[PDB]
């Protein structure tokens, strides 16, 4: 199941900077993961991803391949930048610009990971379904039922870990973390309003998704996703995320804005 | 100084989606502010900027103008999206993708503005600077002054009140262009605060990689706004900052995120 | 009136590969000449134009400028290639790809200039009309009536020369020859059907225009434009042209297909 | 041989406007025929190609696929225009703009086919090439019968005109578009070497560098390539280390079906 997700994030090469991906409406995290893979193939091997910004323009159709075209923007003394277009039926469904940097020691500092319960104690989402294994095991701190909200603070904490063995290749961990970053995210914005994201009449859609990979990490041990929604207004919802490993290291940050509209 | 900037953010048009901008090495906020104008021209009148992401690829040259090419990406039922290339000397120096939406009523919540002293007690940057040195288009009153030449191990937070140094039209578009400009002040340098180095100290290579912004709510820049910045991380010869901009009455008007090179050599 | 073309082809630079040119529908030759200037600005000094191919997508608007955006396609050991996009009202009206080569010594041969009366005995188009000044003086072997017309062979011969003394810069002669190359051309295809090119309800417009500059030349001495229409079929007419100088040297060849339609 | 080429010119679809073609350096005719196929897939079914212009920028490699990217430039009331990029190793080897139009009735005239001996009395290139093959030996996709033979390894000073009859080697489908792709392919044979005739150098002699720069074509009238067509070629000029050739293609009954123009590099080292 992980095996199958990883196989799917490993794209078929059509030509330099033209890739073709299969699908698991497509999960945004699939398009993100796949686009990272596509961009990374066009960069020097040593320069790993440190940031990306993306916009989702159209929904992706899960029954059809997605073509990833990669435009080489710049290769400098430190940075390589690439723009990925995800294409289906001759139309872009998503664009990402990503940047890549050689690892190098420099100034170090970070904030503090929130105080939360460890994972061992907590029930998985698959287990809370008991009242097929998922590629990524999620263990929430607090369960937020998608079919009935309740007015809650705009904060959500979730431990997550790859459901299986991961290879010793940090690039693969980065693609999967890109995938993983689009779970348990945007719905956090509905929490003060008491509506679950899958309730009748709720229109919820990602507009943009951006991520910064600060430090190395592995997804075969537990990471914590700390999400806050600092704002909602104008039928949009805004969420900021930070991903910590179990020892407290700040590994990645994320930002996302989406449509949140009750009909 | 403000009328000059405001004229300078008012772009010379060449065609539908091509614009030329005069410069004031170029200040990142200028490029950001110019690029926003460029995109907003190509969008339908009811739709205002709600977000942008940009990357800086090459330093701009202050002695020459900048061409802004604007690609139309999509015109949806509510959202329009534009990509702006900033071109100098045959080469792109900057790329922004921005999104615009019609003002609409929906779910409202926000976090809480940090408690800080009001602007009235506080000295402006120009005045502080004068001790260890003219009119500036935007006035800045820091809560705590972080000296660009000196500096000590401080918490990676910063708080700065700002306001336009002059008179502003009643066109919200121009405020937004100006807020894009102002968001690139007092920002990335916060990432040096834990390391006891000021950003103008010799050997300090500091440079913006990317700048992104989300305009949550309407505002005016002819009254005082607060910029609350934190550097949540630095590693790998990068520094990372997040910002939030609040009006006096506490309304969260915009958020920003930027990563840059920080290297002492 | 020639001084005002040579200035009108000396394009205003915006940035490297971006060009503004005043208009005088725009002619076509105007667009070709400006396009050729735009491209030559982007190429190494030693390399002069040897060929272009162009398509016409939309009618120009004489009231407004045209931007000419130039993509660099290749810079080889001998040849450089450029694609010029002529933009007005945020739409492309015309595209040209042009190739440039430095003058070099090689194999020489050519065909023979048609047998026609010399220009010295011939009336100019300004004299037959007498029966404002023109930038290029034209003396036709046979004047055709653009609002009348009768059936003749699909061949046309006209001598031409710039109405004025031109600079010693070969580039400007080439821009001007490109301009001149769209005069007395496409109408030739009507000659066999008895219809003038200003007759009412006759739809006529250049689809494509291509040229090869075989040899150096001056447009401040007589050149002969020798034009045949070898075909017309499906609302298109096809012409081929060859341009010889006074002494019989073949300097350029042309080819054009155009819409020719009876409403 | 014909079957194999027709299967090569029928490209694999990767997405809207993105196709990949296998190779028989790459013969220009293959690139041309494949590019017309690519462009035609993106245009309405009734609008057939009437013209194209192309530049060759780098040699193609036969051992690897070619990706054809098709850009939509305009779909107007009558005309659809498309620009095809042939890509290999992330670089363009060739660009083509092609225009397509609705088959209809309008003014009809043409020049006259040159009077040449018919193909029945003429030997084929493959039969003639026996005796020097030790330009080509076994079955070819298109049978060529030249009016005069031009030995690629030994020139003789001759006028800059060439006339050759040609035809597909086998039954072709009843689809015109295939005939057009295959005619695009055929149009690059017996063409640029015509420019060497006055200079008495065979196009395959040691030191002769000959390379297509551009290739353009106009499809005037419908035709079939499973009956004899005449390629009438002339070289009107050479200079500057370039050679210039114009072609006109006639069917046996005298109809002018297509015209062609190419310039190439012709340099003796």
Closest by CA to D143, choosing from D100, D194, D90, D186, is: D186
Structure determination method? X-ray
Q: Among the options D88, D188, D194, D197, which is catalytic? A: D188
User: β-pairing, A236-245 with A250-262?
Assistant: antiparallel
The token pair that represents B164 in the structure block: 């336009």
Closest by CA to A49, choosing from A108, A106, A97, is: A97
Distance from CA of C64 to the nearest CA of D (A): 22
Q: How many B×C Cβ pairs under 8 Å?
A: 25
Q: Where are the alpha helices (DSSP H) in chain D?
A: 2-9, 28-41, 125-129, 176-186
Contacts of A206 (CB under 8 A, 6+ apart): A28, A56, A182, A186, A256, A258
Residue of A15, A88, A90 with shortest CB distance to D67: A15
Q: What is the DSSP letter of D28?
A: H
Chain B neighbors of A101, CB-CB under 8 A: 236-238
The token pair that represents A203 in the structure block: 């229109």
Nearest CA in chain A to B102: A234
Distance from CA of C25 to the nearest CA of B (A): 18
Residues D36 and D88: beta-carbon distance below 8 Å: no
Please tell me the total number of residues recorded for chain C in this structure.
Answer: 263
Name the region of D188 (left: φ>0; alpha: ψ -120 to 50; beta: rest): alpha
Task: Say how far apart CA B254 and CA B226 lie, in whole Å.
Answer: 10
Chain C neighbors of B16, CB-CB under 8 A: 89-90
Q: How distant, in Å, are the alpha carbons of A75, A141, A190, B16, C190 from that of A151?
A: 48, 16, 9, 47, 79
Chain C neighbors of D248, CB-CB under 8 A: 230
Q: How distant, in Å, are the alpha carbons of A101, D4, D24, D37 from that of D8?
A: 42, 6, 7, 11
Nearest CA in chain D to C76: D57
> Residue D245's CB: how many other CB atoms inside 10 A?
24
Residues A228 and A218: beta-carbon distance below 8 Å: no
Task: Say how far apart CA D86 and CA D92 lie, in whole Å.
Answer: 6
Residue of D16, D17, D67 with shortest CB distance to A18: D67
Q: How distant, in Å, are the alpha carbons of C40, C90, C255 from that of C206?
A: 24, 21, 11
Task: Say how far apart CA B144 and CA B159 lie, in whole Å.
Answer: 7
Closest by CA to B165, choosing from B117, B211, B223, B87, is: B223
Q: How many CA atoms lie within 13 A of A35 on its CB side?
A: 33
Q: How many A×D Cβ pairs under 8 Å?
A: 30
Task: Say how far apart CA A195 and CA A187 lie, in whole Å.
Answer: 9
Task: Say how far apart CA A134 and CA A149 lie, in whole Å.
Answer: 24
Chain D neighbors of A14, CB-CB under 8 A: 14, 18, 20, 67
Residue of D76, D106, D268 with shortest CB distance to C234: D106
Q: Which other chains touch chain D, taking contact as 3+ CB pairs less than 8 Å apart?
A: A, C
Task: Say how far apart CA C105 and CA C108 lie, in whole Å.
Answer: 9
Chain A neighbors of B211, CB-CB under 8 A: none
CA dihedral C32, C38, C39, C44 (to 10 degrees): 140
Task: Say how far apart CA D139 and CA B238 lie, in whole Å.
Answer: 65
Contacts of C120 (CB under 8 A, 6+ apart): none
Residues A121 and A81: beta-carbon distance below 8 Å: no
Q: Does residue B208 have an active-site annotation? A: yes
Distance from CA of B209 to the nearest CA of C (A): 25
Q: For the domain B1-265, what is the CATH code?
A: 2.40.160.210
Q: Among the options B184, B190, B244, B256, which is catalytic? A: B184
Nearest CA in chain A to D69: A18
Nearest CA in chain A to D21: A14
The full DSSP string for B59-98 is: ---TTS-EEEEEEEEEE-SSEEEEEEEEEETTEEEEEEEE
Taken in order C24, C26, C27, C30, the sign of the CA dihedral is: positive
Task: Say how far apart CA A145 and CA C94 lie, in whole Å.
Answer: 58
Nearest CA in chain C to B16: C90
Contact B/D (≥3 CB pairs under 8 Å): no
Chosen from D13, D18, D75 to mutate, greatest number of chain A CBs within 10 A: D18
Chain A neighbors of D43, CB-CB under 8 A: none
Residue of A51, A234, A238 with shortest CB distance to B210: A51
The token pair that represents D61 in the structure block: 């490699």
Residue of A107, A208, A228 with shortest CB distance to B53: A208
B90 and C14 within 8 Å at the Cβ level: the answer is: no
Residue of A14, A16, A89 with shortest CB distance to D16: A89
**Terminus-to-terminus CA distance in chain B, angstroms?**
35
Q: Which other chains touch chain B, taking contact as 3+ CB pairs less than 8 Å apart?
A: A, C
3-state class of A164 per DSSP?
coil
C237 and D107 within 8 Å at the Cβ level: the answer is: yes
Nearest CA in chain C to B13: C14
> Residue D118's CB: how many other CB atoms inside 10 A?
12
Chain C neighbors of D108, CB-CB under 8 A: 232-233
Q: Among the options D88, D197, D212, D260, which is catalytic? A: D212
Catalytic positions of A are 182, 206, 256
Residue of C51, C207, C233 with shortest CB distance to D106: C233
Closest by CA to B21, choosing from C85, C87, C15, is: C15
Beta bridge partners of C139: C159
**E strands along D59-157, which residues?**
66-75, 79-88, 91-102, 109-110, 142-146
Residues D135 and D170: beta-carbon distance below 8 Å: no
Task: Say how far apart CA B170 and CA B221 lie, in whole Å.
Answer: 11
The token pair that represents C29 in the structure block: 């030759």
Closest by CA to D3, choosing from D136, D182, D228, D123, is: D182
Percent helix, strand, coil in chain D, to 5, is 20, 40, 40
Distance from CA of D125 to the nearest CA of C (A): 27
Residues B29 and B183: beta-carbon distance below 8 Å: yes
Q: Does domain C1-263 have CATH number 2.40.160.210?
A: yes
Q: Does residue C103 have an active-site annotation? A: no
Task: Say how far apart CA D250 and CA D227 lie, in whole Å.
Answer: 11
Q: Among the options C34, C42, C97, C206, which is catalytic? A: C206
Q: Which other chains touch chain C, taking contact as 3+ CB pairs less than 8 Å apart?
A: B, D
Quick one: B239 exposed, middle or buried, by C-beta within 10 A (0-12, 13-18, 19+)? buried
| Extents of the domains making up chain C | 1-263
Which CATH class for the D1-269 domain? Answer: mainly beta
Task: Say how far apart CA B229 and CA B258 lie, in whole Å.
Answer: 11
Place of tokens 């212009």: D53
Chain B neighbors of C67, CB-CB under 8 A: 14-15, 18
Nearest CA in chain C to B90: C16
CA dihedral B29, B30, B32, B38 (to 10 degrees): 160
Chain D neighbors of A16, CB-CB under 8 A: 89-90
Task: Say how far apart CA A183 and CA A53 lie, in whole Å.
Answer: 17
């Amino acid at each position: 199941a992980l095996e199958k997700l990883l196989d799917l994030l490993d794209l078929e090469k059509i030509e330099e900077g033209i890739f073709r991906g299969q699908s698991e409406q497509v999960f945004g995290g699939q398009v993100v993961g796949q686009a990272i893979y596509a961009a990374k193939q066009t960069v020097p091997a040593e320069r790993t991803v440190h940031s990306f910004h993306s916009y989702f323009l159209r929904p992706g159709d899960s029954s059809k391949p997605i073509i990833y075209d990669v435009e080489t923007l710049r290769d400098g003394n430190s940075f390589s930048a690439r723009r990925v277009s995800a294409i289906q039926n001759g139309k872009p469904i998503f664009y990402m610009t990503a940047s890549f940097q050689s690892q190098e020691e420099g100034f170090e500092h970070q904030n503090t990971m929130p105080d939360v319960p460890p994972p061992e104690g907590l029930m998985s989402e698959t287990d809370i379904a008991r009242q097929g294994p998922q590629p990524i095991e999620m263990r929430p701190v607090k369960f937020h039922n998608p079919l009935q909200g309740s007015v809650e603070e705009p904060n959500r904490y979730v431990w997550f870990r790859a459901n299986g063995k991961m290879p010793d290749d940090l690039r693969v961990h980065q693609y999967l973390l890109g995938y993983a970053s689009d779970f348990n995210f945007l719905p956090t914005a509905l929490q003060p309003h008491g509506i679950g994201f899958l309730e009748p009449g709720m229109q919820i859609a990602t507009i943009d998704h951006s991520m910064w990979f600060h430090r190395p990490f592995r997804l075969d041990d537990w990471l914590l996703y700390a999400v806050e929604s600092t704002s909602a207004s104008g039928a949009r919802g805004f969420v900021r995320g930070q991903i910590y490993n179990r020892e407290g290291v700040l590994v990645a940050s994320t930002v996302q804005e989406g449509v949140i509209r009750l009909h």
